[PDB]
């Protein structure tokens, strides 16, 4: 990977984790 | 959220986790 691609993938990793956390918060709020 | 939205977002969570793992594998393969 180029340095640019490496940087992009590290940023994508953090963003995927943030999206997971947001989804988890929404799902956990759905009281039955 | 509707039950359908709960199901959909749970599936999106699974996909995000898989994509994150694939990106991590690519990052861990890098070399100086
Ligand atoms: Cl949370």
Author numbering:
A (entry chain A), B (entry chain B): 1 to 32
Paper text:
Here, we probe the mechanism of oligomerization of a peptide representing the CCD of the STIL protein, a tetrameric multi-domain protein that is over-expressed in several cancers and associated with metastatic spread.
Our previous studies of the isolated STIL CCD domain (STIL CCD peptide) have shown that a single Leu-to-Glu substitution at position 736, a d site of the predicted CC repeat in the STIL CCD peptide, leads to a decrease in its thermal stability. Indeed, expression of the full-length L736E mutant in Stil−/− mouse embryonic fibroblasts completely disrupts the formation of centrosomes and cilia compared to WT STIL, which rescues this phenotype. AUC-SV measurements at 10 µM and 500 µM of the CCD718–749-L736E peptide returned an oligomeric state of 1 × monomer mass. No detectable change in the Tm at different L736E concentrations was observed. These data are all consistent with the L736E mutation destabilizing the proposed oligomerization of the CCD peptide leading to a folded monomer in solution without the additional stability measured for the WT CCD. The L736E peptide formed an antiparallel dimer in the crystal state. The structure has hydrophobic side chains in the tight dimer interface, which the program SOCKET2 identifies as an antiparallel coiled coil with typical knobs-into-holes interactions.
